[PDB]
């Protein structure tokens, strides 16, 4: 989704002291195919709050 995207978590390279690329946070994500719209709204609000933070 373009409105509420998954943050691009950076990767650290501790030999050059600089970031080595970034990729979407595909590790800390919550499944919601088992949830109806009532909880879909909650999950979307949580993702938006995380983006704001």
């Amino acid at each position: 989704s373009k409105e509420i995207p998954t943050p691009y978590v950076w990767t650290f390279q501790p030999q050059m002291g600089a970031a080595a690329g970034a990729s979407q946070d595909y590790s800390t994500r919550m499944n919601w195919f088992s949830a109806g719209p009532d909880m879909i709204h909650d999950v979307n609000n949580i993702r938006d709050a995380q983006n704001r933070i």
Binding site: N31, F33, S34, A35, G36
Partner: protein, 51 residues
């Protein structure tokens, strides 16, 4: 069939159509139940129902 992909349980509302059980082949619920019993209960006693 716990952690298989093809044959799996689909416990959900009758009209819900969206399954409430997900299994992703990385969870080991058999070992989970084993360790859960081993920690919660004394395992030197044989309980005949569930072996």
């Amino acid at each position: 069939y716990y952690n298989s992909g093809g044959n799996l349980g689909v416990l959900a509302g009758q009209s819900s159509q969206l399954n409430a059980v997900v299994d992703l082949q990385d969870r080991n619920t058999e070992l989970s139940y084993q360790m859960l019993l081993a920690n919660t209960t004394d395992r030197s006693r044989y309980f005949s129902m569930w072996n």
